[PDB]
Amino acid sequence: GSFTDSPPERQIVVGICSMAKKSKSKPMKEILERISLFKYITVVVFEEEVILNEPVENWPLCDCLISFHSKGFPLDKAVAYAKLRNPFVINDLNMQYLIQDRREVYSILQAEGILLPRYAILNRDPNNPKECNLIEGEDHVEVNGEVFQKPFVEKPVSAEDHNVYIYYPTSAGGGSQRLFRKIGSRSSVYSPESNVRKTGSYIYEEFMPTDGTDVKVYTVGPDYAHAEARKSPALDGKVERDSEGKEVRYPVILNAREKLIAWKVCLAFKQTVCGFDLLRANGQSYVCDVNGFSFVKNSMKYYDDCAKILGNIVMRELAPQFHIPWS
Ligand SMILES: Nc1ncnc2c1ncn2[C@@H]1O[C@H](COP(=O)(O)OP(=O)(O)O)[C@@H](O)[C@H]1O
Ligand SMILES: [Mg+2]
Ligand SMILES: [Mg+2]
């Protein structure tokens, strides 16, 4: 007789809501076609034009929503769509405003008792730039009373501004290293300027001496974290590439203390899929950056695991109200 596995048939609908840059990227396509393998799950990718120009009432329906902010994304709308349709939300939307502010990110990490660099916030009133309390010496700064000896790190308050400066002490040749979002072959450049920036609000923080690499961590729920290291952008300024122009990736195995950081970051920020940075310095591991939704690129295993985990999260959560058989 018939061998056909009969249609469910109410599929659980997973909606993907993000800018087309992200929704159509290779890592996204790899992960979604694997999620589509789940018998009871169908993936609806929200068109960018819909997201941008249609009110939320005409956005397609879903049972589970994967949505995340990137440049130009209408987060207000994503949030009103979530309130309207009450779907199961994978990466919390309101947390994503906070993730855009480095002050908020650091406040959350502090409150969760996660090791991060010693730091101070200089808020500059754009109309009274002199008022703000900053005192600068040759090899130090004083922000809100607290003192930072060069080498120190200076970060724009907006987490979406990647113009992070690190200041060299007199004995290292002076000047600064200017980090910026990498296009081209440079990740940073030397500058002879020794005085800190004079407009804008910044976080000043202690420089964590590492071995010249950054540990990049990518979570998929609290019990899964992939890690790899990359050359610190402040080092050569040169991006290292391999055979095929792919950046070079150093091996990392997270220790127990670090697996717990990943578990806590994932939950504290309410982002199932979450990328953050670790600085392995002085026997410990400091989080310096939390970026929210992020895929690993060019890893078959990560694609398989990510899709398997997300798929299972959806099933576990929504199978019961649908009366779908699942353990
Ligand atoms: N406190 C620090 N000590 C040493 N290096 C740091 C420190 N803060 C950040 N860095 C270097 O600056 C790079 C960029 O800083 P990060 O906080 O990740 O900003 P971004 O959001 O633009 O990625 C980090 O990956 C790291 O290599
Ligand atoms: Mg970073
Ligand atoms: Mg960042």
Side-chain angles (χ1 to χ4, degrees), residues 102 106 117-118 152-153 155 158-164 166 179-181 205-210 213-214 216 230-234 277 279 288-291:
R102 293 190 201 276
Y106 268 38
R118 173 175 64 91
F152 68 79
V153 184
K155 300 185 179 181
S158 163
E160 309 185 64
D161 181 350
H162 306 280
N163 297 298
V164 163
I166 305 169
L179 285 61
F180 44 75
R181 185 174 150 276
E205 70 185 53
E206 190 217 310
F207 176 86
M208 305 317 297
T210 78
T213 66
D214 283 340
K216 308 278 190 201
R230 291 182 159 101
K231 189 202 208 163
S232 170
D277 293 326
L279 306 168
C288 65
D289 187 27
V290 177
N291 303 312

Short mmCIF file of all heavy atoms in Angstrom, two decimals, residues 102 106 117-118 152-153 155 158-164 166 179-181 205-210 213-214 216 230-234 277 279 288-291, ligand 1:
data_model
loop_
_atom_site.label_atom_id
_atom_site.label_comp_id
_atom_site.label_asym_id
_atom_site.label_seq_id
_atom_site.Cartn_x
_atom_site.Cartn_y
_atom_site.Cartn_z
N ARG A 102 25.91 50.72 24.61
CA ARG A 102 27.01 50.08 25.35
C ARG A 102 26.89 50.24 26.86
O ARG A 102 27.36 49.39 27.62
CB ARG A 102 28.37 50.60 24.90
CG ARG A 102 28.75 50.23 23.47
CD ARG A 102 30.20 50.55 23.14
NE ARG A 102 30.38 50.64 21.69
CZ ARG A 102 30.59 49.60 20.88
NH1 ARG A 102 30.68 48.37 21.36
NH2 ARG A 102 30.71 49.79 19.58
N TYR A 106 26.71 47.08 29.46
CA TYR A 106 27.62 46.95 30.57
C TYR A 106 26.89 46.91 31.92
O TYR A 106 27.34 46.24 32.86
CB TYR A 106 28.67 48.06 30.53
CG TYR A 106 29.93 47.68 29.78
CD1 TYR A 106 29.87 46.90 28.61
CD2 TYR A 106 31.18 48.09 30.23
CE1 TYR A 106 31.02 46.54 27.93
CE2 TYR A 106 32.35 47.73 29.55
CZ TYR A 106 32.26 46.97 28.40
OH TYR A 106 33.40 46.61 27.74
N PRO A 117 35.70 44.56 31.81
CA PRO A 117 36.70 45.56 32.18
C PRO A 117 36.18 46.65 33.15
O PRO A 117 35.01 47.09 33.07
CB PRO A 117 37.08 46.21 30.82
CG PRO A 117 36.68 45.22 29.79
CD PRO A 117 35.54 44.43 30.34
N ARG A 118 37.06 47.09 34.04
CA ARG A 118 36.77 48.27 34.86
C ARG A 118 36.53 49.44 33.91
O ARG A 118 37.27 49.61 32.93
CB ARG A 118 37.96 48.54 35.78
CG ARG A 118 37.89 49.85 36.58
CD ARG A 118 39.08 49.95 37.54
NE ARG A 118 40.37 50.02 36.84
CZ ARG A 118 40.96 51.17 36.49
NH1 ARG A 118 40.37 52.32 36.75
NH2 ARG A 118 42.13 51.16 35.87
N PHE A 152 44.54 52.50 27.56
CA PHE A 152 43.09 52.41 27.82
C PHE A 152 42.25 52.43 26.55
O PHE A 152 42.74 52.83 25.48
CB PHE A 152 42.59 53.45 28.85
CG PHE A 152 42.65 54.88 28.37
CD1 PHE A 152 41.68 55.40 27.52
CD2 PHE A 152 43.67 55.73 28.81
CE1 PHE A 152 41.73 56.73 27.09
CE2 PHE A 152 43.74 57.06 28.40
CZ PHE A 152 42.76 57.56 27.53
N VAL A 153 41.00 51.99 26.68
CA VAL A 153 40.13 51.81 25.53
C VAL A 153 39.00 52.81 25.62
O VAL A 153 38.46 53.06 26.70
CB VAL A 153 39.61 50.38 25.47
CG1 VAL A 153 38.78 50.16 24.21
CG2 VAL A 153 40.76 49.40 25.52
N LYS A 155 35.33 53.84 23.92
CA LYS A 155 34.26 53.29 23.09
C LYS A 155 33.08 54.26 22.93
O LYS A 155 32.59 54.80 23.92
CB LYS A 155 33.77 51.96 23.66
CG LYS A 155 34.84 50.88 23.74
CD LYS A 155 34.24 49.57 24.21
CE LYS A 155 35.26 48.48 24.27
NZ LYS A 155 34.67 47.18 24.70
N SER A 158 27.05 54.48 21.62
CA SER A 158 26.23 53.71 20.68
C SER A 158 26.97 52.45 20.24
O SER A 158 28.03 52.55 19.65
CB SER A 158 25.89 54.53 19.45
OG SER A 158 25.45 53.67 18.42
N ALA A 159 26.37 51.28 20.48
CA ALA A 159 27.06 50.03 20.22
C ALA A 159 27.18 49.76 18.74
O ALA A 159 27.84 48.81 18.33
CB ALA A 159 26.35 48.87 20.92
N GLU A 160 26.54 50.61 17.93
CA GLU A 160 26.53 50.44 16.48
C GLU A 160 27.62 51.30 15.82
O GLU A 160 27.85 51.22 14.61
CB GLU A 160 25.16 50.82 15.92
CG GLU A 160 23.96 50.15 16.61
CD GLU A 160 22.64 50.48 15.93
OE1 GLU A 160 22.45 50.09 14.74
OE2 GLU A 160 21.78 51.14 16.56
N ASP A 161 28.26 52.14 16.63
CA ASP A 161 29.43 52.92 16.20
C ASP A 161 30.71 52.13 16.57
O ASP A 161 31.08 51.99 17.75
CB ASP A 161 29.37 54.31 16.86
CG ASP A 161 30.52 55.24 16.47
OD1 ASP A 161 31.51 54.80 15.85
OD2 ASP A 161 30.46 56.42 16.87
N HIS A 162 31.38 51.61 15.55
CA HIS A 162 32.54 50.75 15.78
C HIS A 162 33.89 51.49 15.84
O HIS A 162 34.96 50.87 15.84
CB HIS A 162 32.52 49.61 14.77
CG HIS A 162 31.23 48.85 14.79
ND1 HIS A 162 30.96 47.88 15.74
CD2 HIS A 162 30.11 48.95 14.03
CE1 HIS A 162 29.74 47.41 15.55
NE2 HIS A 162 29.21 48.04 14.51
N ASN A 163 33.82 52.81 15.93
CA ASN A 163 35.03 53.63 16.01
C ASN A 163 35.63 53.63 17.41
O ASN A 163 35.56 54.64 18.12
CB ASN A 163 34.76 55.03 15.49
CG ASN A 163 34.37 55.03 14.03
OD1 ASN A 163 35.15 54.61 13.18
ND2 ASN A 163 33.17 55.51 13.72
N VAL A 164 36.19 52.48 17.80
CA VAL A 164 36.79 52.28 19.12
C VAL A 164 38.28 52.63 19.09
O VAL A 164 39.04 52.06 18.31
CB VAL A 164 36.59 50.79 19.59
CG1 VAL A 164 37.51 50.42 20.73
CG2 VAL A 164 35.14 50.54 20.00
N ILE A 166 42.04 52.92 21.02
CA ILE A 166 42.91 52.47 22.09
C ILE A 166 44.13 53.40 22.10
O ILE A 166 44.76 53.60 21.05
CB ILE A 166 43.38 51.01 21.86
CG1 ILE A 166 42.18 50.06 21.67
CG2 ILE A 166 44.28 50.55 23.00
CD1 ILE A 166 42.56 48.69 21.20
N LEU A 179 40.21 51.68 15.57
CA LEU A 179 39.40 50.58 15.06
C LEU A 179 38.18 51.15 14.35
O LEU A 179 37.71 52.23 14.68
CB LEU A 179 38.99 49.62 16.21
CG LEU A 179 40.09 48.68 16.76
CD1 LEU A 179 41.28 49.45 17.37
CD2 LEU A 179 39.55 47.66 17.78
N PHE A 180 37.70 50.42 13.35
CA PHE A 180 36.53 50.81 12.57
C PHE A 180 35.97 49.52 12.01
O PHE A 180 36.63 48.48 12.05
CB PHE A 180 36.90 51.80 11.43
CG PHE A 180 38.12 51.41 10.67
CD1 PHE A 180 38.08 50.37 9.74
CD2 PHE A 180 39.32 52.05 10.92
CE1 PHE A 180 39.24 49.97 9.06
CE2 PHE A 180 40.49 51.66 10.25
CZ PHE A 180 40.45 50.61 9.33
N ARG A 181 34.73 49.58 11.52
CA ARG A 181 34.11 48.45 10.87
C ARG A 181 34.94 48.08 9.65
O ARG A 181 35.25 48.92 8.81
CB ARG A 181 32.67 48.79 10.44
CG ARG A 181 31.92 47.59 9.86
CD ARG A 181 30.45 47.94 9.60
NE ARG A 181 29.92 47.17 8.48
CZ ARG A 181 30.05 47.51 7.19
NH1 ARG A 181 30.71 48.61 6.85
NH2 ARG A 181 29.53 46.73 6.24
N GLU A 205 37.69 52.54 29.37
CA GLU A 205 37.87 51.29 30.09
C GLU A 205 39.29 50.78 30.06
O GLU A 205 40.07 51.09 29.15
CB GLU A 205 36.85 50.23 29.63
CG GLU A 205 37.02 49.67 28.26
CD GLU A 205 35.90 48.72 27.88
OE1 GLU A 205 34.72 49.12 27.99
OE2 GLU A 205 36.18 47.58 27.45
N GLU A 206 39.60 49.99 31.08
CA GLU A 206 40.90 49.37 31.28
C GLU A 206 41.23 48.44 30.14
O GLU A 206 40.39 47.64 29.72
CB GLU A 206 40.88 48.57 32.57
CG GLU A 206 42.24 48.08 32.99
CD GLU A 206 42.21 46.71 33.60
OE1 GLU A 206 41.38 46.48 34.52
OE2 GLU A 206 43.04 45.86 33.15
N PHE A 207 42.47 48.52 29.65
CA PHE A 207 42.92 47.65 28.57
C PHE A 207 43.29 46.27 29.11
O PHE A 207 44.22 46.15 29.89
CB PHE A 207 44.11 48.28 27.83
CG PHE A 207 44.70 47.39 26.75
CD1 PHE A 207 44.17 47.39 25.46
CD2 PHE A 207 45.79 46.57 27.02
CE1 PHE A 207 44.74 46.57 24.45
CE2 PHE A 207 46.35 45.74 26.04
CZ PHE A 207 45.83 45.74 24.75
N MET A 208 42.58 45.24 28.65
CA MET A 208 42.87 43.85 29.03
C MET A 208 43.96 43.25 28.17
O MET A 208 43.77 43.05 26.97
CB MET A 208 41.61 42.98 28.95
CG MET A 208 40.43 43.51 29.74
SD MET A 208 40.85 44.11 31.41
CE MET A 208 41.47 42.61 32.19
N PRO A 209 45.11 42.95 28.78
CA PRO A 209 46.21 42.43 27.98
C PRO A 209 45.95 40.99 27.61
O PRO A 209 45.92 40.13 28.49
CB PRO A 209 47.41 42.54 28.93
CG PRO A 209 46.83 42.51 30.30
CD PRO A 209 45.47 43.10 30.21
N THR A 210 45.72 40.73 26.33
CA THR A 210 45.48 39.36 25.85
C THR A 210 46.65 38.91 25.00
O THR A 210 47.61 39.65 24.81
CB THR A 210 44.21 39.26 24.97
OG1 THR A 210 44.49 39.75 23.65
CG2 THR A 210 43.03 40.02 25.58
N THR A 213 44.64 37.73 20.37
CA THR A 213 43.40 37.25 19.76
C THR A 213 42.16 37.63 20.57
O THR A 213 42.22 37.93 21.77
CB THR A 213 43.38 35.72 19.48
OG1 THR A 213 43.41 35.00 20.71
CG2 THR A 213 44.57 35.30 18.61
N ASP A 214 41.02 37.63 19.88
CA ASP A 214 39.73 37.85 20.49
C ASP A 214 39.01 36.53 20.45
O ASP A 214 39.01 35.84 19.42
CB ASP A 214 38.91 38.84 19.68
CG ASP A 214 39.33 40.27 19.87
OD1 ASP A 214 39.99 40.61 20.86
OD2 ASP A 214 38.95 41.09 19.01
N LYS A 216 35.56 34.83 20.05
CA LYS A 216 34.21 35.11 19.59
C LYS A 216 33.32 33.94 19.99
O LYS A 216 33.63 32.79 19.67
CB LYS A 216 34.18 35.30 18.07
CG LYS A 216 35.21 36.31 17.54
CD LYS A 216 34.69 37.72 17.68
CE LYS A 216 35.55 38.73 16.96
NZ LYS A 216 35.31 40.10 17.53
N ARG A 230 40.11 35.18 16.77
CA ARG A 230 40.57 35.91 15.59
C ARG A 230 41.56 36.94 16.06
O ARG A 230 41.49 37.41 17.20
CB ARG A 230 39.42 36.62 14.86
CG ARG A 230 38.45 35.68 14.15
CD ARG A 230 37.34 36.44 13.39
NE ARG A 230 36.77 35.57 12.36
CZ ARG A 230 35.62 34.91 12.47
NH1 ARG A 230 34.86 35.02 13.57
NH2 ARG A 230 35.22 34.13 11.46
N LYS A 231 42.47 37.30 15.16
CA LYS A 231 43.48 38.32 15.42
C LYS A 231 42.82 39.58 15.95
O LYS A 231 41.78 40.00 15.43
CB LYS A 231 44.23 38.62 14.12
CG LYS A 231 45.45 39.50 14.27
CD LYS A 231 45.74 40.14 12.93
CE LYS A 231 47.19 40.47 12.75
NZ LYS A 231 47.46 40.68 11.27
N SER A 232 43.39 40.15 17.00
CA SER A 232 42.83 41.38 17.54
C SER A 232 42.98 42.50 16.51
O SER A 232 44.09 42.76 16.05
CB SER A 232 43.52 41.77 18.84
OG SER A 232 43.11 43.07 19.22
N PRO A 233 41.87 43.16 16.14
CA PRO A 233 41.90 44.21 15.11
C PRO A 233 42.92 45.32 15.40
O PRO A 233 43.45 45.93 14.47
CB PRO A 233 40.48 44.77 15.14
CG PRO A 233 39.66 43.66 15.62
CD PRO A 233 40.49 42.94 16.62
N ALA A 234 43.19 45.57 16.68
CA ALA A 234 44.13 46.61 17.09
C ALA A 234 45.60 46.24 16.88
O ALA A 234 46.48 47.08 17.10
CB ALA A 234 43.90 46.96 18.54
N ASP A 277 31.86 38.95 22.67
CA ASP A 277 33.32 38.84 22.63
C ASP A 277 33.92 38.54 24.01
O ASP A 277 33.52 39.14 24.98
CB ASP A 277 33.93 40.12 22.06
CG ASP A 277 33.59 40.33 20.57
OD1 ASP A 277 33.47 39.35 19.82
OD2 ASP A 277 33.43 41.49 20.16
N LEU A 279 37.66 38.50 26.21
CA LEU A 279 39.09 38.77 26.32
C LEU A 279 39.70 37.86 27.39
O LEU A 279 39.42 38.04 28.58
CB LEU A 279 39.35 40.25 26.64
CG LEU A 279 38.67 41.24 25.68
CD1 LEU A 279 38.72 42.63 26.23
CD2 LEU A 279 39.31 41.18 24.30
N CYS A 288 33.60 42.03 26.56
CA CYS A 288 33.78 43.46 26.21
C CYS A 288 32.72 43.99 25.23
O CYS A 288 32.63 45.20 24.97
CB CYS A 288 35.20 43.72 25.69
SG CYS A 288 35.58 42.90 24.11
N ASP A 289 31.90 43.08 24.72
CA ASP A 289 30.99 43.40 23.64
C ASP A 289 29.91 42.34 23.60
O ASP A 289 30.21 41.15 23.66
CB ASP A 289 31.79 43.41 22.32
CG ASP A 289 31.00 43.91 21.13
OD1 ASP A 289 30.04 44.71 21.30
OD2 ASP A 289 31.33 43.49 19.99
N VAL A 290 28.65 42.75 23.54
CA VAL A 290 27.52 41.83 23.34
C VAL A 290 26.70 42.31 22.17
O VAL A 290 26.17 43.41 22.21
CB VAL A 290 26.62 41.69 24.60
CG1 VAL A 290 25.45 40.77 24.29
CG2 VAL A 290 27.41 41.11 25.78
N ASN A 291 26.57 41.47 21.13
CA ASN A 291 26.04 41.89 19.82
C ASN A 291 24.67 41.34 19.41
O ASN A 291 24.08 41.77 18.42
CB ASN A 291 27.09 41.60 18.72
CG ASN A 291 28.43 42.28 19.00
OD1 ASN A 291 28.46 43.46 19.32
ND2 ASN A 291 29.54 41.52 18.94
N1 LIG B 1 39.12 46.54 27.38
C1 LIG B 1 39.75 46.04 26.31
N2 LIG B 1 40.99 45.52 26.41
C2 LIG B 1 41.64 45.04 25.35
N3 LIG B 1 41.10 45.04 24.15
C3 LIG B 1 39.84 45.52 23.98
C4 LIG B 1 39.14 46.05 25.07
N4 LIG B 1 37.94 46.49 24.69
C5 LIG B 1 37.72 46.05 23.32
N5 LIG B 1 39.08 45.63 22.90
C6 LIG B 1 39.45 45.40 21.46
O1 LIG B 1 38.57 46.26 20.66
C7 LIG B 1 37.86 45.39 19.73
C8 LIG B 1 36.53 46.15 19.49
O2 LIG B 1 35.84 46.42 20.72
P1 LIG B 1 34.29 45.95 20.96
O3 LIG B 1 33.92 46.29 22.35
O4 LIG B 1 34.19 44.56 20.44
O5 LIG B 1 33.48 46.93 19.98
P2 LIG B 1 32.65 46.48 18.70
O6 LIG B 1 31.15 46.58 19.17
O7 LIG B 1 32.79 47.63 17.57
O8 LIG B 1 32.92 45.15 18.11
C9 LIG B 1 37.68 44.12 20.56
O9 LIG B 1 37.34 42.99 19.78
C10 LIG B 1 39.06 43.96 21.15
O10 LIG B 1 39.97 43.34 20.22
#
